[PDB]
Amino acid sequence: ANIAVQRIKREFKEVLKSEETSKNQIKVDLVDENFTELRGEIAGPPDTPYEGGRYQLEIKIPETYPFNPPKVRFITKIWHPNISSVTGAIKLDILRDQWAAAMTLRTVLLSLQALLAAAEPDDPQDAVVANQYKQNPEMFKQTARLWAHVYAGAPVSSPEYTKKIENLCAMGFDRNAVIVALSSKSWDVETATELL
């Protein structure tokens, strides 16, 4: 608790004030008194499979914060080539390799929304969704819309996938497990149940 967390307080306030007057997209809540863990929430960008969804994030802040970016992770499950589908890790240049002082919390959440709006499958975190994004973009869009509706509270769903997921849950399986098994195995119901 050194005087560079004055900056984390200023940036917390900057996020909270920019939220009301300028938007409603991003949001941050406190977790600890000493300003080292926060709960962020970004809104699904429009004209993407994530539109209509609100995705939550955990942000841990290092003791050197103005330098050496924070550690950000996805709490709610997302289907993105640059976000791990199980761990929630984020492959973003500003989180590992190209962070800079004079970057804000708000800057990071806006950049994460921009990432959700423009992925990069050539520097991927999850290889399966990256391969699906390159080889079958339409099925990827539908699958990420499915994940949005299932986890991030997005409104609408594709019934063709829902019937498959219901038919597999009828076997006495786990909804999240069969979702990842269907999404990873190209939604082949026949080979997804073979994943045991």
């Binding site: 307080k9 306030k13 909270l16 009301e20 809540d29 406190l30 977790v31 008194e33």
Partner: protein, 72 residues
């Protein structure tokens, strides 16, 4: 024109946008709105001193990024 935090007994931190002119009754009304805890059976503690329903935050010298405690 400031933000304050309220620490519950489950150790979560509710963020409230308030003005220094705001009373304690209306700030606990805001707590009720954001959470669902009615003001009846609701006491706020700043530093040892439980806040009174007729006072504002100003005469309690509340400032931005201050931490109140919520009981009952």
């Amino acid at each position: 024109k400031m933000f304050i935090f309220v620490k519950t007994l489950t150790r979560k931190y509710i963020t409230l946008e308030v003005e220094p002119s705001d009373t304690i009754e209306n700030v606990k009304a805001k707590i009720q709105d954001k959470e669902g805890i009615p003001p009846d059976q609701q006491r706020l503690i700043f530093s040892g001193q439980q806040l009174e329903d007729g006072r504002t935050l100003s005469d309690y010298n509340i400032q931005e990024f201050s931490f109140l405690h919520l009981i009952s």
